[PDB]
């Protein structure tokens, strides 16, 4: 079958940046590709047809252009309502294929996390689920690592991250490390300890509290 | 062992779509032998004006058959890609007696493409294809529609100008796509008109070479070739097996616009034959040259006593099904198609049975084990009452050297119930097996 | 079983047959006799009625 | 053949047999329609006193 | 066998469990223990047919007494043909014509029955 | 202008039918092609098939053939899709799509589509309320000027649930994520509130949790 | 052998021919041993049933398939599963060797039928049709 990708799965780019999306194709797709807009939360919006036309209802600062299995749809500036995941869709044989998808994103701010723990609480207790949350305030570079040092023991597989949208604002999330645990392996462990790497950041960082 | 060609040098088997529910369509074209449809012509004889009732294979009258259609492939602006069929290859039907199919009875007429209906293109005669044989099974997936020793095919060629009939060993392919491969969804035929069927240089090994792209067929006893003038008239087509072989009838070089199917070829094939397949044939045109083609009936052959009129030709156009309706058994009765006018009783239903009422320990045959068992003229019985029984399961513990049961069966006399069981044993040698006989002089 | 029912079948279809083929001869016999009768009929009426 | 498959498919070897008997027994019903018709007719034509 | 079974008043020496007739038809004992259940032979409907030559029309008269348990194109009844078939109330069974007039009918005609003479152009019964 | 409505999201069984309709206001309906495209999380968009309502005849994607279903209503203009055996797999949202070309199933481009139906497998699981087992503050989980006071959410059967804060009055470092499947399969999200610790005497934090399907309004102190 | 082997067809004229090469027609190549079939049999799957297979007139054993050209000792077995299409059950071919003669001795069946049209096979070998009027005629099968 006919298995496209998108060469970028992720570029950043302010407003008024000239942007290139790459898509490429298995086998020769003589002028049968679809690029198509998503921004979560609603329909798709339809691009381009035939990789190189505009469909109307778009602004010509996109463009199409390719054949054969070189495809490249342009933004001539970017703008605030450019910024969506965008799919490249084979019309040529049988079923669409999509594309990867490429994310949008601006340098608005390079911010470093500011680093926050919270243990759970007393009726948190008398629940019988004990949870820290690491909270990461404010890092723009999407890239970030975190992991747990609960008394110098690496703890994975029971820690789930959370990030939120562009704030709009500062091009940064707030991102939340939630790490529960049970009575049996919290009240036998005192250091409760969150490894914190940014790029944005300068040094790995640690939020290490010891519990009661 | 004939040679037929060089094998297919191509890795993988193009693609095939299965859309079941683009061939689903109704045009029912039901025998009606008020016109002859579907009738095989006595083998040695002919006739003049007399009308007979004769007793043969035919298709019963009214009976819709089964329909059939081809199609083109995927095809964008000017590049063909996957071919398109149905489920026919899957499906596996069963050879009980024959079958004679209508070919381009839509022909001539203009019809919305079954592939694209709002595309419409006057419709053309196209030719079936089958697989015939006496094994059946699954592919390595699963799928249903493999057949395993020698099998009988039969495919049109040269944009159906020719026949083949061939009597093969067929082995899968490893390539992707291909039966024995990766990613197989139904082998198929094809042949492409762009190349293949140019104007006077019909490519007469298109259609074999696409089927040995799936097939690597192998120790094939014979080969044969039929020529197959061009033009759109409906025609009739015919197969059965005898003793001798199996027969193809066509209506083609005899009765070409009458429809009366003449024998044309008969076939050294000897095993057999229980199940056949059509094979799926997808045309692999460009989307702007979709035509559309005459969906084929096929209808299986049933021992009949057919009233038949004999034209001074000799043509057959006008039959009765003398198991139709009641009618009928009037007029083959009087083997006539004019009865006088009156009230005839005809034969009478009956009803139908439900909920096999019954009413009703352990006959032993210990006796029998314990000990030596007697002379031949020493013989002991042992007679069975009030008791019920299983004989399998005493037999199954010997080798028995003889089964002879008169006026009974070997499976009645494990099944049927009666008053009394008389079984006596002794001891005897196979040499006078000769002399233990009802009808025999010996001592 | 089959090879032997076949014969035994036969048989019975021959037994019937032929008693049937005796039914319809005396019933064409005593049918003229009627019809001869039916004629006398037709002239007592005529004569004694 | 009191309604069994197999004895029908033995019987067609003599269907003729079943269709003699049928048409000459159909005749003779014909036949004795005919002789009823013709001495009412004689009975008939008669000026009944009421 | 294939017969109906019924309940009858008590007859016979009851030590076997067949009653005979003579014939191979037979009473048939008691189903189950301590009852009786006196036997029949299945029962079968007849069929004819009027050909009614001028019309070329059909018209299914059934058996003298025909009328209730028949049905058009019935699933119980299985005939020996290919079940492909060819109502009145109970003059003689029912018909698959259904014309109720009977007007006045002059002497020729089919006459299939005592009173109806079925003329031309189905119009049964009369 | 067309408009794709979609349905709401289905909870059901494993093994179970779902049924997912989307109805086309605008446009010519029965001419055009409306197709089932289906996201899974982190598979991306897949092609299930597809259907032209005049013509009746329904495309279907190679692997959902014979247990996915694509029919069309002529007079309501709305498109179903039915999926048998459901599976962990097939959970997914579904997104009913246009094809802007007046025929032609082969050759499709999406120009207008759903809003999208999740579905959700659901091993016999029944609906019930959730509950506050929050996160309250102290002085070891205030870092600086500020803490952070959380609700939290725990075991509620249908996925759809609602936590507001002082009942609504407290919107300042609301952060909620989403909730996740346990081995379980019970349903269980956060919700944390970056309050200053001068308002934690001052102020007492009561988080309102919402369950619609199990109609429940519960608030527990954090 | 008539039930499990080979049956010609009660009727057709037939003759069936026991004959055997002395030692001149050296061509014929000596086989292995003499090989039959004694039992071709199916069982259900309730294992309480069990239906022999007659060979029909004319034409192949069912369990030909399943039995190669020699069967390798006399006694042999060979069963084989059938498809659900096939009803399924157990198909089971019981085989038979017999020690070979010094001379091979073979066996012909000829079933000739005055039956279809076609042409005609006949020995080979001015009174015709052209003078018509005269008595007595014999054509391609009819005399």
């Known amino acids: 079958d006919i298995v496209m990708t998108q060469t970028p799965s992720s570029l950043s780019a302010s407003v008024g940046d000239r942007v290139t999306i790459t898509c490429r194709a298995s086998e020769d797709i003589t002028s049968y590709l679809n690029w198509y807009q998503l921004k979560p939360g609603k329909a798709p919006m339809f691009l381009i047809y035939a990789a190189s036309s505009l469909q109307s209802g778009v602004p010509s600062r996109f463009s199409g252009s390719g054949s054969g299995t070189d495809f490249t749809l342009t933004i001539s500036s970017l703008q605030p309502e450019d910024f969506a995941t965008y799919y490249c869709q084979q019309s040529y044989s049988t079923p669409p294929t999509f594309g990867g998808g490429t994310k949008v994103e601006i340098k608005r701010t390079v911010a470093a996390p500011s680093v926050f723990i919270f243990p759970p609480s007393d009726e948190q207790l008398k629940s019988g689920t004990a949870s820290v949350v690491c909270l990461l305030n404010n890092f723009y570079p999407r890239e970030a690592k975190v992991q747990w040092k609960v008394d110098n023991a690496l703890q994975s597989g029971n820690s789930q991250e959370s990030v939120t949208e562009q704030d709009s604002k500062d091009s940064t999330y707030s991102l939340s490390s939630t790490l529960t645990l049970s009575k049996a392996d919290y009240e036998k462990h005192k250091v409760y300890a969150c490894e914190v790497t940014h790029q944005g950041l300068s040094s790995p960082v640690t939020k290490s509290f010891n519990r009661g | 062992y004939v040679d037929v060609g060089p094998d297919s040098v191509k890795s993988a088997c193009i693609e095939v779509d299965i859309q079941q529910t683009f061939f689903d369509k109704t045009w029912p074209r039901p025998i009606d032998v008020s016109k002859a449809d579907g009738i095989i012509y006595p083998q040695g004889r002919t006739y003049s004006n007399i009308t007979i009732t004769y007793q043969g294979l035919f298709p019963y009258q009214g009976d819709h058959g089964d329909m059939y259609v081809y199609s083109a492939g995927h095809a964008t602006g000017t590049t063909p890609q996957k071919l398109f069929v149905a489920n026919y290859s899957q499906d596996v039907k069963q050879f009980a007696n024959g079958f004679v199919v209508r070919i381009g009875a839509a022909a001539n007429s203009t019809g919305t493409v079954i592939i694209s209906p709002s595309t419409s293109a006057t419709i053309r005669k196209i030719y079936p294809a089958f697989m015939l044989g006496s094994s059946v099974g699954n592919f390595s997936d699963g799928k249903m529609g493999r057949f395993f020793n020698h099998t009988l095919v039969l495919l049109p060629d040269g944009c159906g100008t020719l026949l083949r009939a061939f009597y093969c060993i067929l082995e899968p392919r490893s390539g992707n796509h291909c039966p024995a491969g990766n990613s197989y969804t139904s082998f198929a035929t094809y042949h492409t008109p762009a190349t293949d069927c140019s104007d006077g240089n019909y490519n007469r090994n298109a259609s074999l070479n696409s089927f040995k792209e799936y097939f690597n067929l192998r120790n094939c006893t014979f080969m044969y070739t039929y020529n197959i003038t061009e033009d759109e008239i409906l025609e009739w087509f015919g197969i059965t097996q005898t003793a001798q072989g199996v027969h193809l009838f066509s209506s083609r070089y005899v009765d070409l616009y009458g429809g009366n199917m003449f024998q044309f070829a008969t076939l050294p094939v000897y095993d057999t034959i229980k199940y056949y397949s059509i094979i799926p044939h997808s045309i692999r045109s460009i989307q702007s040259d979709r035509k559309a083609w005459a969906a084929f009936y096929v209808y299986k052959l049933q021992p009949l006593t057919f009233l038949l009129d004999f034209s001074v030709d000799g043509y057959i156009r006008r039959a009765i099904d003398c198991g139709f309706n009641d009618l009928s058994q009037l007029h083959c009765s009087y083997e006539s198609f004019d009865v006088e006018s009156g009230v005839y009783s005809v034969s009478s239903f009956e009803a139908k049975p439900s909920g096999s009422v019954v009413e009703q320990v352990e006959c032993d045959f210990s006796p029998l084990l314990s000990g030596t068992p007697p002379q031949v003229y020493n013989f002991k019985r042992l007679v069975f009452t009030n008791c019920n029984y299983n004989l399998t399961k005493l037999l199954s513990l010997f080798s028995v050297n003889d089964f002879t049961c008169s006026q009974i069966s070997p499976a009645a006399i494990a099944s049927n119930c009666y008053s009394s069981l008389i079984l006596d044993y002794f001891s005897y040698p196979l040499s006078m097996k000769s002399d233990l006989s009802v009808s025999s002089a010996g001592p | 079983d089959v090879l032997e029912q076949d014969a035994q079948i036969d048989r019975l279809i021959n037994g019937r047959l032929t008693t049937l083929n005796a039914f319809v001869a005396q019933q064409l016999v005593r049918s003229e006799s009627a019809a001869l009768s039916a004629q006398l009929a037709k002239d007592k009426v005529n004569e004694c009625v | 053949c009191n309604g069994f498959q197999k004895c029908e498919q033995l019987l067609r070897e003599y269907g003729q047999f079943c269709s003699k008997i049928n048409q000459a027994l159909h005749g003779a019903n014909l036949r004795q329609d005919d002789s009823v018709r013709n001495l009412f007719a004689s009975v008939k034509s008669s000026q009944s006193s009421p | 066998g294939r017969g109906v079974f019924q309940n009858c008043t008590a007859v016979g020496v009851r030590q076997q469990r067949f009653v005979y007739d003579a014939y191979q038809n037979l009473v048939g004992y008691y189903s189950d223990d301590g009852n009786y259940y006196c036997l029949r032979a299945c029962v079968s409907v007849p069929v004819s047919v009027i050909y009614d030559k001028e019309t070329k029309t059909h018209a299914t008269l059934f058996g003298s007494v025909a009328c209730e348990h028949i049905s058009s194109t019935m699933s119980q009844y299985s005939r020996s043909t290919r079940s492909m078939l060819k109502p009145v109330g109970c003059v003689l069974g029912l018909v698959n014509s259904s014309l109720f007039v009977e007007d006045c009918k002059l002497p020729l005609g089919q006459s299939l029955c005592a009173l109806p003479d079925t003329p031309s152009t189905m119009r049964l019964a009369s | 202008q067309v408009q794709l409505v979609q349905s709401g999201a289905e909870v059901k069984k494993p093994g179970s039918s779902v049924k997912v309709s989307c109805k086309a206001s605008?446009?010519?309906?029965?001419?055009?092609?409306i197709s089932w495209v289906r996201q899974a999380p982190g598979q991306g968009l897949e092609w299930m098939g597809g259907?032209?309502?005049?013509?009746?005849?329904?495309n279907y994607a190679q692997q959902f053939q014979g247990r996915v279903t694509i029919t069309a209503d002529e007079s309501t203009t709305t498109a179903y899709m039915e999926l048998s055996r459901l599976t962990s797999e097939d959970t997914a949202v579904y997104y009913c799509?246009?094809?802007?070309?007046?025929?032609?199933?082969?050759?499709?481009?999406?120009?207008?589509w759903g809003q999208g139906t999740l579905v959700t497998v659901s091993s016999a699981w029944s609906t019930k309320g959730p509950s506050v087992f929050p996160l309250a503050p102290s002085s070891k989980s205030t870092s600086g000027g500020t803490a952070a006071l959380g609700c939290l959410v725990k075991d509620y059967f249908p996925e759809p649930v609602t936590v507001s804060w002082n009942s609504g009055a407290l919107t300042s470092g609301v952060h909620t994520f989403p909730a996740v499947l346990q081995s379980s399969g019970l349903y269980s999200l956060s919700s944390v509130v970056t309050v200053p610790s001068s308002s934690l005497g001052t102020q007492t934090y009561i988080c309102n949790v919402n369950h619609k399907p199990s109609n429940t309004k519960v608030d527990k102190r954090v | 052998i008539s039930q499990f082997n080979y049956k010609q067809s009660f009727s057709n004229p037939t003759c069936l021919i026991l004959a055997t090469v002395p030692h001149n027609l050296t061509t014929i190549t000596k086989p292995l041993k003499y090989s039959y079939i004694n039992k071709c049999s199916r069982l259900l799957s309730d294992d309480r049933t069990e239906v022999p297979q007659l060979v029909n007139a004319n034409q192949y054993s069912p369990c030909v398939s399943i039995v190669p050209s020699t069967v390798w000792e006399d006694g042999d077995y060979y069963r084989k599963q059938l498809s659900p299409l096939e009803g399924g059950g157990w198909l089971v071919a019981s085989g038979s060797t017999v020690a070979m003669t010094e001379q091979l001795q073979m066996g012909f069946g000829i079933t000739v039928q005055y039956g279809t049209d076609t042409n005609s096979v006949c020995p080979k070998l001015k009174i015709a049709s052209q003078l018509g009027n005269c008595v007595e005629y014999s054509l391609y099968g009819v005399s």
């Open positions: 605008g446009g010519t309906f029965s001419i055009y092609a």
């Open positions: 799509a246009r094809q802007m070309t007046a025929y032609d199933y082969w050759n499709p481009s999406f120009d207008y």
């Open positions: 259907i032209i309502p005049i013509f009746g005849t329904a």
